Amino acid sequence: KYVDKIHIGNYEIDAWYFSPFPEDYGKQPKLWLCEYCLKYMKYEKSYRFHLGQCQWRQPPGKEIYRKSNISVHEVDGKDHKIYCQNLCLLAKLFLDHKTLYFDVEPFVFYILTEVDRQGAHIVGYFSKEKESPDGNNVSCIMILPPYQRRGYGRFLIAFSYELSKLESTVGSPEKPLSDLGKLSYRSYWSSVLLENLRDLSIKDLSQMTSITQNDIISTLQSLNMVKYWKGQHVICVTPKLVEEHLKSAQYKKPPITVDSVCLKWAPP
Numbered sequence: 001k002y003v004d005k006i007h008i009g010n011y012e013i014d015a016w017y018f019s020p021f022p023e024d025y026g027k028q029p030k031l032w033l034c035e036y037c038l039k040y041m042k043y044e045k046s047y048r049f050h051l052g053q054c055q056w057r058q059p060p061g062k063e064i065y066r067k068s069n070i071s072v073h074e075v076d077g078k079d080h081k082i083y084c085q086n087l088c089l090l091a092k093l094f095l096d097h098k099t100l101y102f103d104v105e106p107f108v109f110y111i112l113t114e115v116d117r118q119g120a121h122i123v124g125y126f127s128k129e130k131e132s133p134d135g136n137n138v139s140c141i142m143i144l145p146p147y148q149r150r151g152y153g154r155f156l157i158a159f160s161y162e163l164s165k166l167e168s169t170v171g172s173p174e175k176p177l178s179d180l181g182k183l184s185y186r187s188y189w190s191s192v193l194l195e196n197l198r199d200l201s202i203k204d205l206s207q208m209t210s211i212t213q214n215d216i217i218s219t220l221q222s223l224n225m226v227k228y229w230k231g232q233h234v235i236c237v238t239p240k241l242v243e244e245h246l247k248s249a250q251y252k253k254p255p256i257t258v259d260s261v262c263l264k265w266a267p268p
């Protein structure tokens, strides 16, 4: 019997996939997580006791982003081993293709939190290899289900690439991307490419955004905005074909914007 339902903060959330919590925790009906330190418990009474004991009101690590009540925390797998393992155990409940939850030292995690008077509440996260050989600026990305399809996920993609802009490199998410993930990247890419051509070689669109050319190209093929000439992909679009696509219904909700002004990060 596996964990199938968590209680975290003020939400109960059904599980989507199997997550390797220790067998004693699995056999429980419900798992109870401190929304700040991510400690998981088997009983409401231990949960309730911890709630009055817990002194954490925010994630560990450094607050590298803060605009309004949106915040992002940098947490190093090496410096916060237990926390990051709980994080991956939580994320595995909603990621089919994540395979890594105890070997956290090679990774750095970026926690997205929403702040109120009581504290900074975890919305989602993405992981990132300290040293990625395949040039992957994202390993796993996860938005908690009650926060999905409301901007936070795209915000993390943007934030992932702004760190890519500060390291002077291009990066692509590791694969396979989940179903919600595939649709969120194509949408982000489309929106960033379209609003760069309303405002260029493919190699230029690749350095101005740190999007890999394959991701640029494949998105432009999805828009029918690229011609092929003797083995080469060429952007072909009129400013009108950028503007209809840009104002089509899909790009109408006001996103949460990464204001680089408010990003207190420096490359290693």
Ligand SMILES: Cc1cc(-n2cccn2)cc(C(=O)NNS(=O)(=O)c2ccccc2)c1F
Pocket (backbone or CB within 6 Å): 094, 095, 141, 142, 143, 144, 145, 147, 148, 149, 150, 151, 152, 153, 154, 155, 178, 180, 181, 183, 184, 185, 187, 188
């Ligand atoms: C990468 C990613 C992953 C997950 N996820 C995976 C497992 C569990 N969750 C959820 C989201 C998401 O929340 N997408 N919706 S969105 O942020 O509002 C949004 C709006 C416009 C354009 C692009 C996105 C997401 F982006």
Ligand code: NA
Pocket (backbone or CB within 6 Å): 012, 013, 014, 145
């Ligand atoms: Na649910």
Ligand SMILES: [Zn+2]
Pocket (backbone or CB within 6 Å): 034, 035, 036, 037, 038, 039, 050, 054, 055, 056
């Ligand atoms: Zn705690």
